[PDB]
Amino acid sequence: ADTIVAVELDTYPNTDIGDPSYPHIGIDIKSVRSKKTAKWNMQNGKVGTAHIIYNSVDKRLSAVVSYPNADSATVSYDVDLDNVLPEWVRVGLSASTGLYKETNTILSWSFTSKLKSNSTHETNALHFMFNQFSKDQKDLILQGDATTGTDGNLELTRVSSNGSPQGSSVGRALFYAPVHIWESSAVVASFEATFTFLIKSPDSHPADGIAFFISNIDSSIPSGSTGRLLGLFPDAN
Amino acid sequence: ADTIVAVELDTYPNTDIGDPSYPHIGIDIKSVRSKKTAKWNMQNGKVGTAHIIYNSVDKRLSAVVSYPNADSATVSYDVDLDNVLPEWVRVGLSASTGLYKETNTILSWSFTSKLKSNSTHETNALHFMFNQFSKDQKDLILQGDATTGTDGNLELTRVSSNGSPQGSSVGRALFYAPVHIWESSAVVASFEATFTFLIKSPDSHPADGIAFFISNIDSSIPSGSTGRLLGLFPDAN
Amino acid sequence: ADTIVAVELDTYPNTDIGDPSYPHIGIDIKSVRSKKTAKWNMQNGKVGTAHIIYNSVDKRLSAVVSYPNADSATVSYDVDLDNVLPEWVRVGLSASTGLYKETNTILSWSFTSKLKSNSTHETNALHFMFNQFSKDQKDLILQGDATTGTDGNLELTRVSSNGSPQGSSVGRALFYAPVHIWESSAVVASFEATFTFLIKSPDSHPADGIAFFISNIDSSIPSGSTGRLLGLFPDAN
Amino acid sequence: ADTIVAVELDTYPNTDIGDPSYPHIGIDIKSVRSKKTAKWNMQNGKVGTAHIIYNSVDKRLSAVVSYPNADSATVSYDVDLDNVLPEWVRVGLSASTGLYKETNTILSWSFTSKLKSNSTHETNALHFMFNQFSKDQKDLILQGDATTGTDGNLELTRVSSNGSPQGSSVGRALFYAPVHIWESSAVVASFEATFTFLIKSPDSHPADGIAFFISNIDSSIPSGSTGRLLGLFPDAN
Ligand SMILES: [Ca+2]
Ligand SMILES: [Ca+2]
Ligand SMILES: [Ca+2]
Ligand SMILES: [Ca+2]
Ligand code: NI
Ligand code: NI
Ligand code: NI
Ligand code: NI
């Protein structure tokens, strides 16, 4: 199966798979059953921003999510990602809907990864920044229902022509280039990711959420991973 | 055929295809017969650095090459690259040898591309930086004789186990992700590239050179493009 | 006197000092009488963005200004800034009003300068980015009527408590650190600046404009440089 | 007195002020008596590199030091720097000698600080990179015996014309602009610093070391802070 590390922005509480009884941000290490969560005061129809950070010295995966005019939510988990993920990965965004639904619109996405070796200084890096997405966005691998270019955004899940979100949808976008997160000469490896999103629903109970994830390079959407599985996991184990 | 824009570091003068009678730096727009050249005081066995810059406002492709302790060489050419290249490209390094030969060793390579739209501000970017190359460098597409990982470098052309360059060799390395160099909302597009290289030969007359190039995404080494064609062109037209 | 290079966003046509008969963007080299202008379809009350670029290989100062949903305006001028400016400079934003007036509100400002030497690679750089300005913004030198922190913005000229712009106002903001734009070992020097602005006026005829400028490090607002002189020049010569 | 946070590269063991009995890297929070140390296999006459990282989510100050061909040393300490340092700081490098001595030569220094607010995204940043230092390096505040420009380097402590280090020397270099490390709207604040150094001594017992430090903006060298006090502290408390 794939290997997944993710930060979930989980809009729907599924208490039988360990969700708390409220929308939450969570750190997912090879399971949808988050290793750590924090309450997230999700705002339907507002643009929010998520930040994810990690480095190999501290071995702590941390995330922060906020909206304008509001306090932030944060979660952290101690994990050595070199013991979870392969040396080469892809990075992506995933989202889903089920019988409950929402738009999962990405307005911007940036990522920076650095590997500093013991040669003088000496730095290896990848950075990308999307503030618009066009119809044929050749540096993204789109999976499932994901599309680019409508209002210049990345729509991870299906939206009707009128703009209404659809249920039973899953989609992902992965950056085209593989990312090197460990190398034998590295003395420090780090990454940072940011994305801005708009989750809107006509309903009092939106579902299911958006995640930033890191995977094996050949990761694909698991069968049946609509809804609570966030397009990331094949089951709720 | 492919579409190629390149900056050549041309170590061998082929006067019947328009080279000046000395090693030179040149700007190549769809032909090995450079549109502009400048004299280049190439130093066998020393590490040099090349810089390439362009933006869509000025429409001027410029390059500078230098060694430590030495003066630089520079060349510029007025060209609207949106009239030459497709909207999506790959970027790469190429080198060749013929009956005359040299090592074509790359010690570092960086690239930055930016597309600024009329949305507030708003910036799209790709950056990469290699200061080492490992054996399985999954974010490079290696073509021909190119290899990575020997002494942590990118060897574009074949080198024997003892370190001696071989003749009749061609190789290229392209960054894995496609690069977006034009978009309909962009108000300014720019790129910059830098690479450090070591060209060494046991011979008084090294050949053939190294180039930084921009191509159609599916570019491959043309048949017969050893030697004076730099792994870039199918003929000398 | 000071030495000034500037890109003006000139909102009021002063035809006796060479302005065209419309709002314009211009390149000013030691004089308010621009060396080059282009028509600028200024939009009262909308947030716009300006970009300024230069490098020492091409010796061309270029600027672009745009609004969302609108075409851009651009201007370029061939000038070797090493023949105009000292080796160390400060960079800043300036604005003014006269008997006609406008707000001169800066929402964001970024700047990057690079000096690449002939040592391997080897790069020297300064970058800053402001997306908010607080009350005590210690890394800006504020001159004249400029203030920071109201609605998190930089107000270059005076605004009343109700938000109404005042006449006969001038103000500037300079980044605190001096900037090195020439060095004897540099093989390429470059800079880029971006700022986002909001010019609003209750009047059909706003005045006077906003400029990005580069000066001697000890530059101060010249006496009498309200209005058409943009806080930059002591006279209209 | 000043407020100092530093990462020390401590070349001389002063066991009565808590140094371990070997050269070490240490985290110093308002005292020379490090809160955490790690063994450092210092190599006389070789160029090394140090990296320092911190963010306000994790509240962990970490450092790594290495040489080419050698293993690294690392140290970390949990500290909320917003409870130690003021909101505005300067950043610097310091070094000293006493009756034992060494050169304290800086070949390169980079720094990046970021403040991400809850406005969309939205980022504030400062970055600088020095890979050479010239005679009149106007963006550095030099204190004590520090000089710039000899062989294009920053010599923090006194070196004779022949290149021999002198005893009883102290010197510092601070970046000219103040740095904003906390702001009330920030959701994440981070910094990273890197420097490359050459510590050489004719002696079997070099002293005293080099530190990267963060201070109140008006920090000056304390009286009597040669030798074991690293130009940072007024006493050994
Ligand atoms: Ca859930
Ligand atoms: Ca040739
Ligand atoms: Ca005017
Ligand atoms: Ca000591
Ligand atoms: Ni959950
Ligand atoms: Ni040629
Ligand atoms: Ni004008
Ligand atoms: Ni110590």
Swiss-Prot record, chains A, B, C, D:
Chain residues that bind Ca(2+): D10, Y12, N14, D19, D208
Binding site for a carbohydrate: L99, Y100, D208, R228
Keywords, sorted A to Z: Antiviral protein, Calcium, Glycoprotein, Lectin, Manganese, Mannose-binding, Metal-binding, Plant defense, Signal
Post-translational modification: The mature chain consists of residues 164-281 followed by 30-148. To form a mature chain the precursor undergoes further post-translational modification after removal of the signal sequence; cleavage after Asn at positions 148, 163, and 281 is followed by transposition and ligation (By formation of a new peptide bond) of residues 164-281 and 30-148. This maturation (circular permutation) relies on the legumain AEP1 activity and leads to an increased stability of conA after heat stress and at various pH.
UniProt miscellaneous comment: Binds one manganese (or another transition metal) ion and one calcium ion. The metal ions are essential for the saccharide-binding and cell-agglutinating activities. Displays strong antiviral activity against herpes simplex virus type 1 (MIC=0.32 ug/ml) and the rubella virus (MIC=7.2 ug/ml).
Keyword DNA-binding: no
Single GO BP term: defense response
UniProt-listed PANTHER family: CONCANAVALIN A-LIKE LECTIN FAMILY PROTEIN, LEGUME LECTIN DOMAIN-CONTAINING PROTEIN
Matching Gene3D superfamilies: 2.60.120.200
TM spans (from-to): none
Binding site for Mn(2+): E8, D10, D19, H24
Keyword Transferase found: no
InterPro entries linked to this entry: ConA-like_dom_sf, L-lectin, Lectin_LegA_CS, Lectin_legB_Mn/Ca_BS, Legume_lectin_dom, Leguminous_Lectin
One Pfam assignment: Lectin_legB
Family to which the UniProt record says this protein belongs: Belongs to the leguminous lectin family.
Quaternary data: Homotetramer.
Name assigned to this protein: Concanavalin-A
